[PDB]
Amino acid sequence: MIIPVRCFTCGKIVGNKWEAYLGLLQAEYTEGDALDALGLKRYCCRRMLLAHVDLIEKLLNYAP
Amino acid sequence: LSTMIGKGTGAASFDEFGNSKYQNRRTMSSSDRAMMNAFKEITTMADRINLPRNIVDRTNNLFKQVYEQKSLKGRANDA
Amino acid sequence: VGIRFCQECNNMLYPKEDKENRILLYACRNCDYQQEADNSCIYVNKITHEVDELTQIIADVSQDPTLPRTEDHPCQKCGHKEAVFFQSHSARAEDAMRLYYVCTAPHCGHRWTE
Amino acid sequence: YARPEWMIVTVLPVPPLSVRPAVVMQGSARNQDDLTHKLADIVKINNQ
Amino acid sequence: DEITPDLWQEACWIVISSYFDEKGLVRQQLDSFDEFIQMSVQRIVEDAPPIDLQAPPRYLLKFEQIYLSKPTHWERDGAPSPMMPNEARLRNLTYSAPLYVDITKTVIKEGEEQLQTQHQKTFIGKIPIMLRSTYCLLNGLTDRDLCELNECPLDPGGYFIINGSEKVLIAQEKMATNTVYVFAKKDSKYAYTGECRSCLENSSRPTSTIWVSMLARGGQGAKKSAIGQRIVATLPYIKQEVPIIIVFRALGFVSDRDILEHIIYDFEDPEMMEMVKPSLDEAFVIQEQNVALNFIGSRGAKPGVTKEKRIKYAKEVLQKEMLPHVGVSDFCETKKAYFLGYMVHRLLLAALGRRELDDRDHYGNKRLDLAGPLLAFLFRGMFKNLLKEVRIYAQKFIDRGKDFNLELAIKTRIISDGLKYSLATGNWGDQKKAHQARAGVSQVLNRLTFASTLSHLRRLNSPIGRDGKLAKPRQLHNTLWGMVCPAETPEGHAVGLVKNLALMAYISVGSQPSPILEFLEEWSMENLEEISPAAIADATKIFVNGCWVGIHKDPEQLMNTLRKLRRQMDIIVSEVSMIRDIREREIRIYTDAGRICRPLLIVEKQKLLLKKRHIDQLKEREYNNYSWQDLVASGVVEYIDTLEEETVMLAMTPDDLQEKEVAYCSTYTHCEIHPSMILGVCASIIPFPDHNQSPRNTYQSAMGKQAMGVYITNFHVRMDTLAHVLYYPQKPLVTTRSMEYLRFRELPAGINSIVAIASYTGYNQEDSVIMNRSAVDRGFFRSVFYRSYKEQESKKGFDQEEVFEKPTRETCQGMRHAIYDKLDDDGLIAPGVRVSGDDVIIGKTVTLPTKRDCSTFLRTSETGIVDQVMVTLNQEGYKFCKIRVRSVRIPQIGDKFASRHGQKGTCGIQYRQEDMPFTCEGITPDIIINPHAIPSRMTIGHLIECLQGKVSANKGEIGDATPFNDAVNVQKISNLLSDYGYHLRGNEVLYNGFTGRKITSQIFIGPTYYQRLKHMVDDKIHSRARGPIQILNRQPMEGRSRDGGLRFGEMERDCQIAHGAAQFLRERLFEASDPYQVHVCNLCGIMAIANTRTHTYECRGCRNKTQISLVRMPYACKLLFQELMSMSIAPRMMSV
Amino acid sequence: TVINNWLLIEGHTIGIGDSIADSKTYQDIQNTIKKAKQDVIEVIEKAHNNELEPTPGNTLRQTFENQVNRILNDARDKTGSSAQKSLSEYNNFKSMVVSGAKGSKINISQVIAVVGQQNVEGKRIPFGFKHRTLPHFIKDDYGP
Ligand SMILES: [Zn+2]
Ligand SMILES: [Zn+2]
Ligand SMILES: [Zn+2]
Ligand SMILES: [Zn+2]
């Protein structure tokens, strides 16, 4: 639903990079380039963002 | 409480000429038969105006007491 | 082998012999009609029944897009190079792997077996 | 131990309740056994 | 211009993208229901004969028009309001729309005066509404609107909400009707049997089947052997087989020549003539139509008192009961004679071996009954009942001489309840007639996973009963290509019987054949009633929906004209099948529903009619109005059914098969849009499924249905009995093109995991898995389990009622050792309260005739937190409460985990990050699987996905694993991986976490998409130690939820016998199950009456009370003996 | 216990690299298959030309299938053997087969060389369609 706080493999913090990752892609960055710009070198972390699905945005559509 | 005979399957189940020898019999009591019909009528009226089942349940209870009390025995069951 | 019906009530005609003339006759049961027999053969039973499959083949099969087409077997009648070949796939043969060729040229439904 | 006439049902045995117990489900409304249901038909017809 | 091979891969998936953008995935469900409501319901009402009353005044009733409103709910005060689908789910309502009909009442009073009155929009019941259908409230609502209604836009609909239960009608597979099929029974007395299941147009009174069979030659006799084999017909309502020739005589054809003219179209063929000779001899006695009719009437359903009745009955059966689809009028004898002769002619060809026997497994001979045809069948009976009671009610009032109120004559329960009951229970037909009712038609929609939800809506049910066993129906027939998923099928008794549609596969909704028949008459087609029998030999028979309409002398031109019309959508709709049997000189046209078809690209002169312009137009699918339907209109893509596929020469791909090459096939008629479309919803999520053993692909198909994730976006609003939600679902790093159309990205059901295939500590052996404890601590595969408890307080009885309250141990009679403190004053627990086993969430008390306790106890194993406590009024108007308990499921040892390649495995052990092996970069695998799982299973696609996933994560691009893609190769993937500083084969040097030493062998490690399966150990762990016992047998209860005992079955009993463990066998079967004691008379082995309180033991029957023996035997043995006694048996236990 | 703890040092895996074969091996497998294709074609021509003499005790159809199956079965065996030879001592597929822990030589051949003939009820794929297995094949297509 939401980007995980830590990378499941090594525990690197990735919950502060989703908005930045989205912004980079909005800036025409390729997914690989955006991940590199965010410092995610280990492919375990690149997996965290490259495969993340932000369903929480859909959940916010429904009224509380 | 009673059991209804099922439909025949083999030739032995049918009489010498077509009709099944084993036929269901009306063993329901007259009081129960009338009461059963009244509940069927109650449900029919409720559906016409889309009344919830709980009201129907209350109505069925009311009729049973009225039917058993027998003060309105002279009046039609539908009324 | 042939089948005949009486001209009177159009019912099946069955063979019958007349002792007086000793000549085969075909007589109708429900009609009493009689006819002279010319075939002289009541019936023939073909155990092998090696019926020429070419007769059974229909020339229209050349219009089938799923049948293979070969240009190496020109039509013997019209000489058309393209031809369509296939197997009998008829039961009671007990064996069928030979190819039956039909000319693909329209209006020339020539059929042959190599 | 076995007489041929005994094979003819003269008196029908009625199983104990434990053989045909009623099960409680969805409130205090006993649901009688199939054997109990059948016994009613037998009791009604023979009485009739 | 033309699509080059370099652009074909993009072009075809654009075509596929448009198809799903328009059709969706539950189109067959919605389209079928739409046809039923729009057409079938009106047709059934119109087709109903006017009701005529005469008992004098004469009353006529006619139902003119059918009106349907929005799904409406009525509050207890009577105020109507639109019923939102979410409301029905929460309040356990039925999603149904009020049904109204215009009725015209005309009365003739014998005074030459007619009074006509119309009762406009007369309510006649409620029809359940398929969600998102044309008549559904959600219909035509934008995604934003659906969100405002607490409805998931991704929800495909296609299901019914009955009493709040989402119900899906499973497509029922049946043999095609009105079609002549010849089968040979090896054991039966008939060498061959030609059957035809004839049904009326619009599916009137159910199908009538007629069998034409040829007697086997097994019978030995001088007369029987000489004549040969005779043909007999099994007409409906006839006890015994009737000789075929007699039937023709009854039709009005007496002369042998006339009869043979309808059976044999070429008298020049002697072999066929000899076949019918024995049949002629059999019916030689009967030489008159009336005599033939009397003979048939003799075997009628009821005995005929007189000959006139027998003849009349026989004509009645032939007129309508025999070949009804051919005709039901009195002038149809000639039409039926031709069709009956065709059946005989077909039988002769099979007997002669000239025509191959029909295959039951061929789906060209099969039809799928969808909700539309399904619901229409029910509605016909209910409406007939509605008119039956209307006639009955009106008869009573007209008999008394008083006029009748039309509204009071209509019983709305007939349709409202009848439709609801069939969907509610799944028993198909009538509740009274449940014996013959088809079961399993309606099932509760599966919400475990979105793919599972999608699969359930595309499921197919085979006619063969599950209990029966037969390989042939369970086999993967060739005709399943492109129509049904070859991999998706359940394991067990249902293998090969329950099926799922292929990705583009579509089921024809059916249409009227009138336009086709009219065109055929306009075209140079000779009517069957006008031609002579001699002309049939050369001409080709024309069949429309199984009815022989006529003959044509130019089949090739007619087929081309018909094909042109369908491609242009002029007179022939897309879903019409036109099949020309060139060898058999037959053209079959099909227009009914239930025909499975898929879209195929049209090929002309080895060239695709699809050009670059169509692709470009599709590329701008939006703001252009160019859609998939334009491709069909353009005539470049058409739908092909199974039957027409036999006559289609198809190309797998245009890039290779169309191109000039070694001459194999220069005449191609169609081409696949993409070969990967043969897979279903579940099989479509397998990456590289063409590299795995086929059984593995099937296994994953089942496993994918059980994978946790987000089954729906609005799950929070829903209150489902069971629901599993994964915290952090991930879209696969390696995906397939089809996955875009499954919405798998929007609702993923797994996490991409760093998987190392190594033998680390032996804790992953035998399909076991080692998980990373640290990763799990970070939310890895962590999930929610949501369980909803619904309780209803209902007052029914003179003084008996149920209420929600806290039951005091003194006030209420019933009580349990559970805890009742959590309950609030209103008898309902509050949200946010931790609840464990043996806890009361709902305090329900029923007044005692002081009050018994019916409180709801939380599941013993369950330990969660009350999530939601919803209170409302149910469909019955009683107070209704739903309580959702939320429990967090952290992956434990024993929890099932599977890849997308059938490699399922429980967690054997969880190691911390330091304990796990690590690469030089410090990466530890999230999961470790045994290498031994791969070789035997040959799940090579699993290895490729791991290799591709490694490239995808490093490259930053989602990998493509479409099965049949030459552009992707292992060498290609390996080369890409080398570019990122990794071994080209995915191997890495791993260090022992316990010692830090390099492992001698380099480990295959990489990202792989795994999924947590619903099966969790905590939900399966069960222990029994002197629990409760069942009343009937006094043995341990059954079921984990009931704290029941494990069954010690015969096999276990047999096993201990081989072991020789007599006492343990005694313990299990006697001591641990039902130790019981009885008193038995010594004289007679019958049980004696024992009064332990009085210490008096007597045997009524022996008049003795001094010699009674106590016997220790199982209670079941007592029950058996008692039960045997009920059958007059005397099991006498003798101790001597 | 003893060897499990030793395996923590030596280790054991299975991956793509163990599924690969030398390009020379691939050529040998491809050549063997190509030869098999011609051999079946030659037999088909003999049957088509009525040049096939039925084996005693078997029908012409049975003889044709026996020859075709024998040719393809031999090709599968030859291709499987070729793949096995190419495997090195470090190959993990061979490791689990020689030990007998899991898999068989057939599994290795299928993963590397060819899956082989698919049979239904002991026979090749039947003509579920009219004289053909699938709509993508011409009628009377008896090729492998
Ligand atoms: Zn990381
Ligand atoms: Zn005659
Ligand atoms: Zn020619
Ligand atoms: Zn006694």
Q: What is the DSSP letter of E918?
A: B
Of E574, E569, E568, E570, the closest CA to residue E590 belongs to E574
By Cβ distance, the residue of D1, D13, D35 closest to E1128 is D13
Ramachandran region, residue F49 (left: φ > 0; alpha: ψ -120 to 50; beta: rest): alpha
CA distance B13 to D26: 38
Contact E618, E339 (CB under 8 A): no
Domains of chain C: 1-45 (no CATH), 46-114 (2.20.25.10)
CA distance E29 to E36: 11
> B7: annotated binding-site residue?
no
Which chain C residues contact residue E255 at CB under 8 A? Answer: 5, 9-11
CATH of the domain at A49: 1.10.10.60
Contact E598, E639 (CB under 8 A): yes
Residue E790 tokens read as 């619904």
What DSSP letter does each residue of chain B carry, written as one string? ---------SGGGB-TTSSBSS-------HHHHHHHHHHHHHHHHHHHTT--HHHHHHHHHHHHHHHHH-TTTTS-S--
CA distance E262 to E847: 78
**CA E321 distance to own-chain centroid:** 31
Q: Where are the alpha helices (DSSP H) in E426-554?
A: 450-457, 471-474, 514-522
Residue F73 tokens read as 């079965």
CB under 8 Å to E1047, separation ≥6 — which residues? Answer: none
Q: Dihedrals φ, ψ of D40, to 5°?
A: -60, -45
Contact E41, E602 (CB under 8 A): no
CA distance E47 to E41: 10
Classified as helix, coil or strand, F131 is: coil
CB under 8 Å to E906, separation ≥6 — which residues? Answer: E767, E768, E769, E893, E894, E895, E896, E897, E1017
Q: How far is the CA of E291 from the centre of ligand 2 (A)?
A: 18
CB under 8 Å to E593, separation ≥6 — which residues? Answer: E32, E35, E367, E370, E372, E373, E507, E508, E509, E510
* D11 in contact with chain E, both atoms CB, cutoff 8 A: no
CA distance E596 to E574: 12
Helix (H), strand (E), coil (C) string for E217-281 = CCCCCHHHHHHCCCEEEECCCCCCCEEHHHHHHHHCCCCHHHHHHHHCCCCCCHHHHHHHHHHHH
CA distance E948 to E966: 15
Contact E265, E533 (CB under 8 A): yes
The CA-to-CA distance between both ends of chain B, in Å, stands at 28
C-alpha count within 13 angstroms, C-beta hemisphere, residue C108 = 16
Q: Which residues of E are catalytic?
A: 767
CA distance F129 to B21: 52
CA distance B20 to E457: 44
Q: What is the DSSP letter of E1044?
A: P
Beta-strand pair E171-175/E459-461: parallel
The CA-to-CA distance between both ends of chain A, in Å, stands at 16
Residues of D (28-47) whose Cβ lies below 8 Å from E: 28, 35
CB under 8 Å to E672, separation ≥6 — which residues? Answer: E482, E600, E601, E650, E651, E652, E653
By Cβ distance, the residue of E271, E280, E648 closest to C12 is E280
Contact C28, E284 (CB under 8 A): no
Is the CB of C58 less than 8 angstroms away from the CB of E669?
no
Cα nearest neighbour of B43 on chain E: E413
Of E805, E819, E921, the closest CA to residue E852 belongs to E805
**C-alpha triplet E672, E678, E680: angle, nearest 5°:** 145
* E167 in contact with chain D, both atoms CB, cutoff 8 A: no
Q: Which long-range contacts (CB under 8 A, 24 or more apart) does E855-858 make?
A: E855/E807, E855/E816, E855/E818, E855/E820, E855/E823, E856/E789, E856/E791, E857/E816, E857/E818, E858/E789, E858/E885
Contact E1004, F16 (CB under 8 A): yes
CA distance E954 to E967: 20
CB under 8 Å to E42, separation ≥6 — which residues? Answer: E65, E66
Contact E886, E867 (CB under 8 A): yes
Residues of E (992-1051) whose Cβ lies below 8 Å from D: 1031-1032
Residue E295 tokens read as 């003979």
User: Which amino acid is present at E94?
Assistant: T
Q: E380-417 burial, b for 16+ CB within 10 Å, e for fewer?
A: bbbbeebbebbeebbbebbeeeeebebeebbbbbbbbb
By Cβ distance, the residue of B49, B52, B64 closest to E877 is B52
Cα separation values, E583 from C96, E670, E915, F117, Å:
17, 21, 73, 31
Helix (H), strand (E), coil (C) string for E633-700 = HHCCEEEEEHHHHHCCCEECCHHHHHCCCCCCCCCCCEECCCHHHHCCCCHHHCCCHHHECHHHHHHH
Rg (Cα) of chain C, in Å, rounded? 22
Q: Detail the residues of C annotated as belonging to a binding site for Zn(2+).
A: 6, 9, 28, 31, 75, 78, 103, 108
Fold of E1040-1127: DCoH-like (3.90.1800)
Of E731, E599, E652, E573, the closest CA to residue E20 belongs to E599
Residue C44 tokens read as 């023939």
Please give the sequence-ordered ranges of beta strands (E in DSSP) within E890-972, or none if there are none: 896-898, 904-911, 927-929, 959-960
**C-alpha triplet E598, E600, E601: angle, nearest 5°:** 165
Contact E947, E673 (CB under 8 A): no
CA distance E1075 to E1063: 14
Cα separation values, E186 from E183, E217, E465, Å:
10, 12, 22
CB under 8 Å to E392, separation ≥6 — which residues? Answer: none
Cα nearest neighbour of A2 on chain E: E728
Is it true that E179-367 and E1040-1127 share their CATH fold?
no
CA distance E38 to E31: 10
Q: Dihedrals φ, ψ of E573, to 5°?
A: -75, 165
Sign of CA dihedral E788, E789, E795, E797: positive
Of E210, E216, E211, E214, the closest CA to residue E186 belongs to E216
Ligand index nearest the alpha carbon of residue C112: 3
Is the CB of B44 less than 8 angstroms away from the CB of E878?
no
Residue A58 tokens read as 């859909």
Number of residues that this document lists for chain B: 79
E and A: touch, per 3+ CB pairs < 8 A?
A: yes
Residue E394 tokens read as 């009106």
- The residue range of the domain holding A18 is 1-64
How many separate domains does chain A show?
1
CA distance D7 to E828: 61
Q: Which residues pair with A52 in a beta bridge?
A: E730
CA distance E719 to B57: 27
Classified as helix, coil or strand, E417 is: helix
CA distance E733 to E1008: 8
How were these coordinates obtained? cryo-EM
Of C16, C103, C94, the closest CA to residue C61 belongs to C103
Chain B interface test: which of E72, E74, E405, E880 (most B C-beta within 10 Å): E74
Residue E709 tokens read as 């994730």
Q: Under an 8 Å CB criterion, which residues of E touch B?
A: 74, 76, 78, 80, 123, 301-303, 407, 411-413, 416, 435, 794-798, 873, 875-878
Is the CB of E649 less than 8 angstroms away from the CB of C1?
no
Q: How far is the CA of E346 from the centre of ligand 2 (A)?
A: 28
Is the CB of D13 less than 8 angstroms away from the CB of E1032?
no
Chain E: nearest CA to B11, how far in angstroms? Answer: 11
Rg (Cα) of chain F, in Å, rounded? 20
Chain F: nearest CA to E1005, how far in angstroms? Answer: 8
Question: Which residue is associated with the tokens 């007990």?
Answer: C94
Ramachandran region, residue E276 (left: φ > 0; alpha: ψ -120 to 50; beta: rest): alpha
Ligand index nearest the alpha carbon of residue C106: 3
Q: Dihedrals φ, ψ of E686, to 5°?
A: -80, 125
CA distance E162 to E83: 13
Is the CB of E267 less than 8 angstroms away from the CB of C56?
no
Cβ-based contacts under 8 A for chains E and F? 130
Q: How far is the CA of C28 from the centre of ligand 2 (A)?
A: 5
Fold of E179-367: 3.90.1110
CA distance E341 to E337: 6
Which chain B residues contact residue D38 at CB under 8 A? Answer: 3
CA distance E954 to A40: 10
What DSSP letter does each residue of E355-371 carry, written as one string? SPPPPSS-GGGEEEE-H
Cα separation values, E1099 from D12, D14, E215, E1084, E1095, Å:
20, 18, 66, 9, 14
Is the CB of F59 less than 8 angstroms away from the CB of C95?
yes
Cα separation values, E155 from E85, E92, E450, E668, E902, Å:
12, 19, 9, 39, 27
CA distance E210 to E203: 17
Cα nearest neighbour of E802 on chain D: D27
Cβ-based contacts under 8 A for chains C and E? 61
Cα separation values, E32 from E28, E159, E206, E366, E1121, Å:
6, 12, 19, 17, 56
CA distance E148 to E138: 11
CB count within 10 Å of CB E343 equals: 24
CB count within 10 Å of CB E1016 equals: 21
User: Which amino acid is present at E41?
Assistant: V
CA distance F65 to E847: 79
CA distance E1084 to E291: 70
